[PDB]
Design a protein around this motif. Structure first.
Motif, short mmCIF file in Angstrom:
data_model
loop_
_atom_site.label_atom_id
_atom_site.label_comp_id
_atom_site.label_asym_id
_atom_site.label_seq_id
_atom_site.Cartn_x
_atom_site.Cartn_y
_atom_site.Cartn_z
N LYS A 137 53.36 12.24 46.80
CA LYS A 137 53.09 11.89 48.19
C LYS A 137 54.34 12.29 48.97
O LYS A 137 55.23 11.47 49.16
N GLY A 138 54.44 13.56 49.32
CA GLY A 138 55.62 14.06 50.02
C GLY A 138 55.46 14.10 51.52
O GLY A 138 54.46 13.61 52.06
N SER A 139 56.45 14.68 52.20
CA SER A 139 56.38 14.89 53.63
C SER A 139 56.79 16.33 53.79
O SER A 139 57.96 16.67 53.71
N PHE A 140 55.80 17.20 53.93
CA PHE A 140 56.01 18.62 53.94
C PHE A 140 55.12 19.30 54.95
O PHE A 140 53.95 18.94 55.08
#
Ligand SMILES: CN(CCO)S(=O)(=O)N1Cc2ccc(Cl)cc2[C@H](C(=O)Nc2cncc3ccccc23)C1
Ligand SMILES: CN(CCO)S(=O)(=O)N1Cc2ccc(Cl)cc2[C@H](C(=O)Nc2cncc3ccccc23)C1
Ligand SMILES: [Cl-]
Lengths: 305, 305
Positions: A137-140
């Protein structure tokens, strides 16, 4: 005191980030010694992604088709090869900022720091975990491909993840630094979906021990459980099965707090049943699963409050 | 996609961290050009800390009493002076890794990255906010004193915080880099307590806009409110008053989502009077207030350094 989602200092990794360009595509690369590592999809167009034949696309390329930029300096590509889903670009200059490093493949539940980059420039650092369904669950955003995940225990950087794609649910998929994907994913634009996700049970337990260390016990009870009964209950809330390995790994935290692992398992069963009733645990109203037993021992004090 | 508590890349700050030792006390220092900055309480013993006359304690010290270590190299102290609650140690070597920098004092509600250090060695990086009661909810153990808070604006590091102490509730207190404390705190062993805290309203609103940008819109409603009616409700729930400046600052996020600031205020009013009803926003069951409007724009736009 306090408990934060803490990332490793990113300096050793910032000195390795470069920009890689192939035609109209621009993404990030990792420059270690005289090799730049990046996703092999840098050679694809948007149309190619449906069914790309990477070997056929790569054979048509020469070293000078790849443009590599490190800060304001253009590096010269002197060789190229593909290893699984990673492209390895041999350059004429060894990175003088190359840290002591290893490539390690992690298992679901393991945590790592992500240095998100765009155009070979680092923008931010955050901590995350390899989900049981192998996604993160990244922020990309678009252009983040090639950003890396790592741990820095002692003075050695252990590279464990390279960003490749965003799945339809907004979650992210990528590979280890040898180009092998985590999960049943392919670097192809096909109907691929993340499997049903579950909670990392051993991590929630570790975080409950961190709360005890920091001085909070409101959630404990006078009960114990068998490992089998705990798992029967846990799987009804979409929690990963807790194995004997997990119990063994929690041993040091159990001895530091005086609460047996199966005793903490009984508190977890009760929290799942009752909720928090307006209370928080380490400033959170949800049960946190992105801190491993190792992260807790690293961040918390050795003396229980 | 995704929304994480993201810190600035710490590399430019890691190259400034040093270990300062005075007698039996060891803590961290910031080495910029030929000066090392550290908390002045490094000169105090446990008894001295009860009622310290810092000028009297300092006059009895010579340059050689201060031991400064940068990695494995010993730095030679050639002068020393005090500015408010910070000690400035003149050293014989300018830091070759000195970045472009400024010392800036922040206001409550503003966020910053913390590079936590022990023995002049960086151990982790996390993001946090200056609470309305001037404390920070950090993660620090003994030996963390001298760790710094910062932001990056283009290529310039803005140092805004230096860690000094922990309050009885587990929260933290410190100074700007000119040695002026944030809050009504003093650097000594005496009865001190954090005041009653409040929620940073403009930050919760920014985080609600970030959730809308990420597809979480269940909390939107057809209603609006006046600024006065919103503040009457917000005062009842220990929320900071929302000013016209805050409304102006949220303008870009309001234009990107098509949701007026007072429209989002009506959603916040309903969340405060009814709760979340079993739902989450960006994976949280609490209303998050440690992302400023600028943090939301930067993370949702990919700004690099
Ligand atoms: C997501 N896309 C499909 C939408 O119709 S895409 O932008 O065309 N897409 C397709 C695609 C397919 C396979 C592989 Cl290996 C990489 C990619 C690319 C991709 O995943 N890049 C992105 C990575 N991380 C976050 C991203 C957030 C936002 C956008 C793009 C991101 C490019
Ligand atoms: C009473 N103490 C701990 C407070 O809970 S103490 O260890 O004696 N204490 C006294 C004291 C007084 C004034 C000033 Cl300016 C600094 C200090 C020191 C202090 O605050 N350092 C610490 C900072 N951050 C986290 C810390 C976690 C644990 C311990 C110490 C920490 C040292
Ligand atoms: Cl692992």
């Amino acid at each position: 005191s306090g408990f934060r989602k803490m990332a490793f200092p990113s300096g050793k990794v910032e000195g390795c980030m470069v920009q890689v360009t192939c035609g109209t595509t621009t993404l990030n690369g990792l420059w270690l010694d005289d090799v730049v590592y990046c996703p092999r999809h840098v050679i694809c167009t948007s149309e190619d992604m449906l069914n790309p034949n990477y070997e056929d696309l790569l054979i048509r390329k020469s070293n000078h088709n790849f443009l590599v930029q490190a800060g304001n300096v253009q590096l010269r590509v002197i060789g190229h090869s593909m290893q699984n889903c990673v492209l390895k670009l041999k350059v004429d200059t060894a990175n003088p900022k190359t840290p002591k490093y290893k490539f390690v493949r992690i298992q679901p539940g393991q945590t790592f720091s992500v240095l998100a980059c765009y155009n070979g420039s680092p923008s931010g650092v955050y901590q995350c975990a390899m989900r049981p369904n192998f996604t993160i669950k990244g922020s990309f955003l678009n252009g983040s491909c090639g950003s890396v995940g790592f741990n820095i225990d002692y003075d050695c950087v252990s590279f464990c993840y390279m960003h490749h794609m965003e799945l339809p649910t907004g979650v992210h998929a990528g590979t280890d630094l040898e180009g092998n994907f985590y999960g049943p994913f392919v670097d192809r634009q096909t109907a691929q979906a993340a499997g049903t996700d579950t909670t990392i049970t051993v991590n929630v337990l570790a975080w409950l021990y961190a709360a005890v260390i920091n001085g909070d016990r409101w959630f404990l009870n006078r009960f114990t459980t068998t490992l089998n009964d705990f798992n029967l209950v846990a799987m009804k809330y979409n929690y990963e099965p807790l194995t004997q390995d997990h119990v063994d790994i929690l041993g040091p935290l159990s001895a530091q707090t005086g609460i047996a692992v199966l005793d903490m398992c009984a508190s977890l069963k009760e929290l799942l049943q009752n909720g928090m009733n307006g209370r928080t645990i380490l400033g959170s109203a949800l049960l946190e699963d992105e801190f491993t037993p190792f992260d807790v021992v690293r961040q918390c004090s050795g003396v229980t409050f």
